Design an enzyme around this catalytic site. Sequence first.
Site, PDB file in Angstrom:
ATOM      1  N   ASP A 154      76.908  31.602 112.339  1.00  0.00           N
ATOM      2  CA  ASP A 154      75.516  31.859 112.743  1.00  0.00           C
ATOM      3  C   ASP A 154      74.812  30.589 113.196  1.00  0.00           C
ATOM      4  OD1 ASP A 154      73.173  33.380 113.381  1.00  0.00           O
ATOM      5  OD2 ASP A 154      72.665  33.774 111.270  1.00  0.00           O
ATOM      6  N   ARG A 158      67.593  28.023 114.736  1.00  0.00           N
ATOM      7  CA  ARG A 158      66.882  28.567 113.561  1.00  0.00           C
ATOM      8  C   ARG A 158      67.618  28.190 112.261  1.00  0.00           C
ATOM      9  NH1 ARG A 158      69.195  32.744 116.343  1.00  0.00           N
ATOM     10  NH2 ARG A 158      71.057  33.595 115.336  1.00  0.00           N
ATOM     11  N   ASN A 159      68.926  27.906 112.365  1.00  0.00           N
ATOM     12  CA  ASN A 159      69.840  27.572 111.281  1.00  0.00           C
ATOM     13  C   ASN A 159      70.167  26.067 111.212  1.00  0.00           C
ATOM     14  OD1 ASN A 159      69.777  30.079 110.092  1.00  0.00           O
ATOM     15  ND2 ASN A 159      71.271  30.913 111.453  1.00  0.00           N
ATOM     16  N   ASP A 172      70.176  26.303 106.376  1.00  0.00           N
ATOM     17  CA  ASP A 172      69.173  27.346 106.288  1.00  0.00           C
ATOM     18  C   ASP A 172      69.182  27.867 104.855  1.00  0.00           C
ATOM     19  OD1 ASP A 172      71.831  28.814 107.456  1.00  0.00           O
ATOM     20  OD2 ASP A 172      70.663  30.233 106.272  1.00  0.00           O
TER      21      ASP A 172
HETATM   22  C1  LIG Z   1      72.482  35.800 102.860  1.00  0.00           C
HETATM   23  C2  LIG Z   1      72.628  34.448 103.483  1.00  0.00           C
HETATM   24  N1  LIG Z   1      72.759  34.397 104.817  1.00  0.00           N
HETATM   25  C3  LIG Z   1      72.929  33.186 105.367  1.00  0.00           C
HETATM   26  C4  LIG Z   1      72.973  32.029 104.585  1.00  0.00           C
HETATM   27  N2  LIG Z   1      73.323  30.795 105.212  1.00  0.00           N
HETATM   28  C5  LIG Z   1      74.446  30.078 104.889  1.00  0.00           C
HETATM   29  O1  LIG Z   1      75.151  30.352 103.926  1.00  0.00           O
HETATM   30  N3  LIG Z   1      74.784  29.084 105.766  1.00  0.00           N
HETATM   31  C6  LIG Z   1      75.264  27.758 105.893  1.00  0.00           C
HETATM   32  C7  LIG Z   1      76.439  27.560 106.588  1.00  0.00           C
HETATM   33  C8  LIG Z   1      77.103  26.343 106.524  1.00  0.00           C
HETATM   34  C9  LIG Z   1      76.600  25.301 105.796  1.00  0.00           C
HETATM   35  C10 LIG Z   1      75.382  25.433 105.087  1.00  0.00           C
HETATM   36  C11 LIG Z   1      74.778  24.332 104.422  1.00  0.00           C
HETATM   37  C12 LIG Z   1      73.564  24.466 103.805  1.00  0.00           C
HETATM   38  C13 LIG Z   1      72.902  25.685 103.809  1.00  0.00           C
HETATM   39  C14 LIG Z   1      73.444  26.775 104.440  1.00  0.00           C
HETATM   40  C15 LIG Z   1      74.697  26.688 105.110  1.00  0.00           C
HETATM   41  C16 LIG Z   1      72.784  32.166 103.157  1.00  0.00           C
HETATM   42  C17 LIG Z   1      72.684  31.069 102.157  1.00  0.00           C
HETATM   43  C18 LIG Z   1      73.258  31.203 100.891  1.00  0.00           C
HETATM   44  C19 LIG Z   1      73.160  30.177  99.955  1.00  0.00           C
HETATM   45  C20 LIG Z   1      72.484  29.013 100.267  1.00  0.00           C
HETATM   46  C21 LIG Z   1      71.908  28.867 101.516  1.00  0.00           C
HETATM   47  C22 LIG Z   1      72.008  29.884 102.458  1.00  0.00           C
HETATM   48  N4  LIG Z   1      72.625  33.399 102.653  1.00  0.00           N
END
Ligand SMILES: Cc1ncc(NC(=O)Nc2cccc3ccccc23)c(-c2ccccc2)n1
Length: 301
Positions: A154, A158-159, A172
């Site tokens: 994703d 925005r991310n 994000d």
């Molecule tokens: C339901 C949901 N949808 C999307 C979510 N995004 C991600 O998991 N993405 C991410 C990808 C790769 C490196 C990352 C590094 C830091 C933060 C997010 C990262 C979350 C999530 C869950 C727990 C902590 C935060 C974000 N939860």
Amino acid sequence: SGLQGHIIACVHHIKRRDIVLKWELGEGAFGKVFLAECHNLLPEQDKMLVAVKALKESARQDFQREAELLTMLQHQHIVRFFGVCTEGRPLLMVFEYMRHGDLNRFLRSHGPDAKLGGEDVAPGPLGLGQLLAVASQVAAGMVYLAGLHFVHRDLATRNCLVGQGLVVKIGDFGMSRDIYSTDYYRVGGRTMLPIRWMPPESILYRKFTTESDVWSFGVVLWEIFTYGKQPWYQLSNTEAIDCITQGRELERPRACPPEVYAIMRGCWQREPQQRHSIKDVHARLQALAQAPPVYLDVLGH
Ligand SMILES: Cc1ncc(NC(=O)Nc2cccc3ccccc23)c(-c2ccccc2)n1
């Protein structure tokens, strides 16, 4: 699902007394985010601000797996994860606070469509050099993830988050599908796809690789040079799927020099094997970003 996809224990813990919730920053379907004051977290500071993700059965197991994976994922262009708070409820994930918020919001507020000081950046739209340093930092984070063989799924502005001194990091708090719902196409029930950021193999064959992330980076590059505009904004979701599957490419943004557009086109090769690696896309953008202003002013006609 981001972190969840890579999963499917030296996790640091913080005491509840050490985290003081100030106010909410946002709220979604999987939980909410608050600005908090954190004590005895980092030396020479004593007290510091953080962004706290509060977990809204298997959720607790998913949380620990997410936390373990976030403890591994530590890089200068990945939002910093400090640890968790498990004593009592709600369970919390503690991250660094990024003052300028998400990259989309930051780009739109420094674009020709913005309402109207400037501690970190000059008045009016972001210059070519400003847009390139942003791009380079995102590419660098994607290099680290590809290096750890992590498939984001994703990647979009925005991310990404922006902090003091215009530091850009991938990250994000899981609220994008709630805050930017029009950036997703709802298939059925809960499933929401970021189709405008997906290559033809992800739309057609439902395949997600390191190479589909490179295509998304290509689209993130387009968002950077269009000041956060949605890709294929002029199209409906079905019209956008049609264009992507038929091989159509997004037009060269106005602020984009042909050399930057060559990086985009290289990310957008129909054949995933033909796509230029992210290690090279970053090496290409970094070189461009730190290039002298005499060379850079020539690039932007
Ligand atoms: C339901 C949901 N949808 C999307 C979510 N995004 C991600 O998991 N993405 C991410 C990808 C790769 C490196 C990352 C590094 C830091 C933060 C997010 C990262 C979350 C999530 C869950 C727990 C902590 C935060 C974000 N939860």
